[PDB]
Amino acid sequence: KPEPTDEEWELIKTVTEAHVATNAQGSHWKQKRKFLPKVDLEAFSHFTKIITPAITRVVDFAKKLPMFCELPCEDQIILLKGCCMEIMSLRAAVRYDPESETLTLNGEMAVTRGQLKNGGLGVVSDAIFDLGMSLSSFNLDDTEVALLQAVLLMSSDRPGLACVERIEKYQDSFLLAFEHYINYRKHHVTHFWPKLLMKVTDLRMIGACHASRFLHMKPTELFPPLFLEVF
Amino acid sequence: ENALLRYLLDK
Ligand SMILES: COc1nc(C(=O)NCC(=O)O)c(O)c2ccc(Oc3ccc(-c4ccccc4)cc3)cc12
Numbered sequence: 001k002p003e004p005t006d007e008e009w010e011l012i013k014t015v016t017e018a019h020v021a022t023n024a025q026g027s028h029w030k031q032k033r034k035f036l037p038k039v040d041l042e043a044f045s046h047f048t049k050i051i052t053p054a055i056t057r058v059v060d061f062a063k064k065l066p067m068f069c070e071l072p073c074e075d076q077i078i079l080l081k082g083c084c085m086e087i088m089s090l091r092a093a094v095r096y097d098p099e100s101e102t103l104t105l106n107g108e109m110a111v112t113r114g115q116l117k118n119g120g121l122g123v124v125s126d127a128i129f130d131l132g133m134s135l136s137s138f139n140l141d142d143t144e145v146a147l148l149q150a151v152l153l154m155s156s157d158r159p160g161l162a163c164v165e166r167i168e169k170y171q172d173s174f175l176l177a178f179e180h181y182i183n184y185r186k187h188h189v190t191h192f193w194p195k196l197l198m199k200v201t202d203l204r205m206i207g208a209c210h211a212s213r214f215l216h217m218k219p220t221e222l223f224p225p226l227f228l229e230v231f
Numbered sequence: 232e233n234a235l236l237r238y239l240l241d242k
Contacts, residue, residue, distance in 0.1 A: 073237065076240050080236065226236065
């Protein structure tokens with residue numbers, strides 16, 4: 001079970017630090033938590049007003065990865081539009097609390113499956129909640145979360161990209177470092193790396209359904225601007 | 232298009 005190379009330990013440091021500096025409320029998300037009261041456009045309203053800072057945190061995460069910063073702005077835009085809801089969904093799923101059955105948004109707002117579903121997310125709310133439940137036994141630390149985020153960001157198959165092959169190599173570096181970190185961490189769950197790769201697929205489905213749903217059916221001034229831009 | 236995101240990226 002190969003463990004992290006030194007060049008991979010500093011990539012682990014770079015990514016973990018980027019995640020921790022752009023992750024809302026850091027460790028005090030549970031205490032700061034505030035429980036909230038077809039589509040409820042009033043529930044919708046409350047959610048659209050609170051997605052802008054969550055999108056901005058993803059932008060900030062990416063900007064703290066030098067490999068991201070090396071790409072042309074046209075590719076940076078494409079990578080961020082692709083992975084934004086994938087990372088927001090992971091960051092909320094890892095904050096699943098089984099006792100209240102809530103996820104935490106912006107490190108401060110606890111929401112139920114029914115609330116998020118009626119905020120306009122539909123089946124995506126069940127997919128995010130199910131992921132959170134499945135992730136409770138994975139005991140993902142900040143490093144494992146940051147690396148998953150970095151794998152999702154460096155997706156070479158987003159349409160319209162120019163630097164397809166450089167982005168692929170960035171991702172291969174992250175995947176190798178991450179598997180080696182997982183070897184070092186020796187989790188007590190069988191076939192951990194294969195099961196983690198299935199969780200990536202789960203997040204990609206959330207990203208592809210999110211994007212599809214925006215497109216579908218829906219007055220757009222009612223949507224935050226940064227959120228119209230990411231669909 | 233993608234002009235807020237562009238501003239936020241280029242700093
Ligand atoms: C995963 O989803 C979300 N995560 C966070 C977040 O903070 N995550 C944890 C973290 O980053 O620390 C939020 O802050 C969110 C705010 C509003 C929101 O609301 C929507 C979005 C899309 C739609 C939608 C999409 C497509 C079509 C129709 C509606 C509806 C409500 C969804 C949020």
